[PDB]
Amino acid sequence: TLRAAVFDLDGVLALPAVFGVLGRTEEALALPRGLLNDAFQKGGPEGATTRLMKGEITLSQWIPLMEENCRKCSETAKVCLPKNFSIKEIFDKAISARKINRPMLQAALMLRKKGFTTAILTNTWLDDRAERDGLAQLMCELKMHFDFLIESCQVGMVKPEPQIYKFLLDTLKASPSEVVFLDDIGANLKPARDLGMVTILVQDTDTALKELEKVTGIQLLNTPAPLPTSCNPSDMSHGYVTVKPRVRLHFVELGSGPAVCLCHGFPESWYSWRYQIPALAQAGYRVLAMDMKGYGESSAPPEIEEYCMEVLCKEMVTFLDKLGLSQAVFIGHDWGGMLVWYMALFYPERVRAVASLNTPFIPANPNMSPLESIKANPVFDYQLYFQEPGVAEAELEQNLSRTFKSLFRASDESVLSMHKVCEAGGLFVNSPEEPSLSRMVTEEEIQFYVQQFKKSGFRGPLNWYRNMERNWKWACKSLGRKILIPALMVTAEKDFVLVPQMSQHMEDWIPHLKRGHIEDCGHWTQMDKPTEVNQILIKWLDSDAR
Amino acid sequence: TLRAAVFDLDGVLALPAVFGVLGRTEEALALPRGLLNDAFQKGGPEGATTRLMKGEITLSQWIPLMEENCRKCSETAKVCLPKNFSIKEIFDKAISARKINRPMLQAALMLRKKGFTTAILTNTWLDDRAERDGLAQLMCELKMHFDFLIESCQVGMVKPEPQIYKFLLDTLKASPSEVVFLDDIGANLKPARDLGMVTILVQDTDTALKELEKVTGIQLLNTPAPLPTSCNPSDMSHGYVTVKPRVRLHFVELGSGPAVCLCHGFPESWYSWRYQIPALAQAGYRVLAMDMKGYGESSAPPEIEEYCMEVLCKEMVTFLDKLGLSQAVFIGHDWGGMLVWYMALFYPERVRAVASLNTPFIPANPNMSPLESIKANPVFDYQLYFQEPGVAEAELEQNLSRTFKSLFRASDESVLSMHKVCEAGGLFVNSPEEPSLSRMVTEEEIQFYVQQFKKSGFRGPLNWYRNMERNWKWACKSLGRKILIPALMVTAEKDFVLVPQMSQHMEDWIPHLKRGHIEDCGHWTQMDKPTEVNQILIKWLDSDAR
Ligand SMILES: O=C(NCCC(c1ccccc1)c1ccccc1)n1cccc1
Numbered sequence A, B: 001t002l003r004a005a006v007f008d009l010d011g012v013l014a015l016p017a018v019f020g021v022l023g024r025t026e027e028a029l030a031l032p033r034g035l036l037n038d039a040f041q042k043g044g045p046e047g048a049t050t051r052l053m054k055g056e057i058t059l060s061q062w063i064p065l066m067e068e069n070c071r072k073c074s075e076t077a078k079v080c081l082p083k084n085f086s087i088k089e090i091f092d093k094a095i096s097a098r099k100i101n102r103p104m105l106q107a108a109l110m111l112r113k114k115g116f117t118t119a120i121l122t123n124t125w126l127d128d129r130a131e132r133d134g135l136a137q138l139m140c141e142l143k144m145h146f147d148f149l150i151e152s153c154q155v156g157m158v159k160p161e162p163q164i165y166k167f168l169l170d171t172l173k174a175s176p177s178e179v180v181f182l183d184d185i186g187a188n189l190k191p192a193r194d195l196g197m198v199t200i201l202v203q204d205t206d207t208a209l210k211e212l213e214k215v216t217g218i219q220l221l222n223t224p225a226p227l228p229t230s231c232n233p234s235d236m237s238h239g240y241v242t243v244k245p246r247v248r249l250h251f252v253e254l255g256s257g258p259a260v261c262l263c264h265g266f267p268e269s270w271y272s273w274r275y276q277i278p279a280l281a282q283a284g285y286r287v288l289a290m291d292m293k294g295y296g297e298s299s300a301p302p303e304i305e306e307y308c309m310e311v312l313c314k315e316m317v318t319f320l321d322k323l324g325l326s327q328a329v330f331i332g333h334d335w336g337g338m339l340v341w342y343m344a345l346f347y348p349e350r351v352r353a354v355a356s357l358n359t360p361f362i363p364a365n366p367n368m369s370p371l372e373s374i375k376a377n378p379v380f381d382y383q384l385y386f387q388e389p390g391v392a393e394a395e396l397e398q399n400l401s402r403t404f405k406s407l408f409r410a411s412d413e414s415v416l417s418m419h420k421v422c423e424a425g426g427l428f429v430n431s432p433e434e435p436s437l438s439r440m441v442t443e444e445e446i447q448f449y450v451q452q453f454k455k456s457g458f459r460g461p462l463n464w465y466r467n468m469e470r471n472w473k474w475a476c477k478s479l480g481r482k483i484l485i486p487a488l489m490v491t492a493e494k495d496f497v498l499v500p501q502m503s504q505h506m507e508d509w510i511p512h513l514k515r516g517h518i519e520d521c522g523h524w525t526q527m528d529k530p531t532e533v534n535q536i537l538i539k540w541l542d543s544d545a546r
């Protein structure tokens, strides 16, 4: 029966409430009890604050009106306002102190996941202070988790006027008995309750959440920690840069601040960074998640030599030039991580900082070709199978759903063996035709990769493996160099191909290298342990790349 | 006969040269003459500096090798190096002091315009210092003006080795007698001269430019000030954001730093900001030049109500939300400027700063509809002609080349009269069928707009004029507000429609408003006076929006 939940911003989704700060200011300044809250409410529906909440005036126009209300109130109370009394300082500090009430937001996110329509109905103002960006950032973080955001100053109505509740019900397309309304002010609950809405008076979050649990029949308190916020591809800004006549690179962009370039591995997409993109934008970074050459909406020329590391690195530099970026932080995973180490060795002036997930920096051996080094490790046998053009493309393109279901699995769910792939005649020869869905991915996420690989296939992606000799001769030019810019190596405990021990001698080449290690994490690092990846990257970016 | 010009970076395109700074350090530190230049060249082809210029080692690896060369040199000279002697401090200060030699760059730009292939051939290093961004920014600014950039550390060869000159001729596809080579080091001229190239020894820029004038037969010195750098659409990063199910906005993006949103007028394009986009990116801003709703690659829904200011402003806020931008500086011209004032009145928390070119802030009059106010000015008669759907679309779409040739003219070239458009039965009824090309625009620039308007026509653009009543009723909600965020009004002397005197009472509503005025500037401000617009915007952005 209940299908919508409406939350107030102040005192419910954001703590502390402004009224709580007015009460603390009177206690700190030895002012009469309720003096500031009386000045705030002065005039009722015809007062300065109602005009402010309705959007008739801005916050800066209201500030001297509130100051005058404070003096009028103090004159009747027979008291004197302190020497340096300022409404602006009081409100700036109050607005700045207000943070998201994470448990209340987790409950709203959980109700929305269970089919509820969620809305914020708040009495707010048009903020024109020099510090208005702090409020704008809070509103941006919150509004993405709600279906509707109704602000009094935009609709010209305020709570507790009965018209804003009628407006709310029309916006939600729901009848009052289908709506739960949460508010910290009892006067704002009264009109919702007259219409027949379920109301919860928020004094403390825990008791408010227990009432919300009891009335919705959904567990909100004591539930497990949720996964990070993910990307909806159709909600992303899509960018397209032509780096050379036939090569165009596609990227997805989110955030402002230092540029951070995300480089995916094989056989992946910009979508492989879906849990990182919102967290990294929220941390204060401009994230550019690439579709590498040969993938998704990026150009996929058929020629092998178009995917040698030298051409690939030169095109990433041109990509920076065309976007007008002198530097970017380069974060790679798998083949992307292989590329970001060579970006640091050949173009250090364009790389602000370098991070690799799973992929170690392995210097080229001038005494041995990479094809003879590949044969010396039985786990790299699938790389010899990928050499002959057409062979692996036929197997990997035959059934796209099966390809991504067999590959994208947690370490304990792996249904493939990378050794003796050549003798068996394929990657999937002793694997099920219909593999089960991994606990790591959903069916909708698997179909995104299927749709992406339906466009250009596996030729471009497989050509990254077909330049062993060209990459080796080019890497041999950097054997006298060291990586002396900020660098991070993240190892994944359960990656059986890119094993953590493959990274142990990296300090000889990158002496001030920072490390990260993720336990119980397989190859697909970003989607296997998203919270752990986000915390390791955000901490290193904040300290070494800012 | 001469068809290529090659310039060195150090001492030719960038001043001062590193060798000049080594000589000044010896004079300042009372060290023997030539001591630092001997340490620099120590070992010749087998020394640390040749290894650095060839890309064998990075700048940070070379620094302690140069320090050791300095001590070895001082021991034979029987002298002591000062207490705080540091190669890093000396090189950081030398690299940082180096600026673009504007006259030398203007000459290269002029030779390229006259059909010459231009190249930079430099002995440079892989810079991995914490301060390497300064060098990266210099290289980015320069490389866009040259056909080729050959760096010794990338090709493994150095000047004066004869192989780098053979490599240069193969890259240019030219024979030595067709090439002019400019260098400040005489030893680097010798091999170019042996091949038969024309060489110029650059001691001072003026004498070097007189030699270049005499040999090319092209005037380089004393020529007029050139127009700002323009945009090549195919070299731009193209962004696409879906703001609502059927509405997608297209933008072009360049730069890093605070976000700056450019909003064009009628009947224009993101391309109207072609002279501003590179200058603003170079000034340290992330420029987003929009194709407004109804134009170019942005969605053009047929419905009139899709272009009312309220819908338009809400979609620009959603545009910011989807890109993850809490704020942007909004700079508008014409209809774009009309929109940026309403972005400041309704969403001040999302607007970092607001600037309008030509368009004044005119508050809504609640006692008079905007249609009766339009009739009271004979110059706004074309707005009544634009009211009836289909009529103006038929005239403006009939001949696209004629439409843009008749509109895009300087104040003295205007071939149209905006008064009595209704009585005459059209904008072009007493105008030539083939108007001459204005001195402001080229034929290629006119064809860009023709190609853009061939897609969705004039319906969407004309619908901005068909919401007079809806815009008026919505603007009447902001009559009690003031604009209290940083604001700039730029007036154009010769705009006969959006006359400068229309802006005189703006201070009553925007009390701390900053002003700009451009003399001998008509309606098409950005392309009429691009250098003047760029300087007014960059100065205001640097002081009020940073
Ligand atoms: O082969 C490389 N990555 C693909 C590994 C992947 C894979 C192997 C074989 C086929 C497809 C995908 C994998 C999947 C699961 C577990 C470990 C590894 N690298 C080569 C140098 C840098 C990357």
Ligand SMILES: O=C(NCCC(c1ccccc1)c1ccccc1)n1cccc1
Pocket: B265, B266, B267, B334, B335, B338, B359, B382, B407, B418, B427, B495, B496, B497, B498, B523
């Ligand atoms: O009509 C508006 N701008 C178009 C002016 C333009 C023009 C007028 C008529 C047709 C096309 C283009 C013009 C061209 C040349 C000189 C002055 C003005 N505004 C309405 C409010 C804000 C903008």
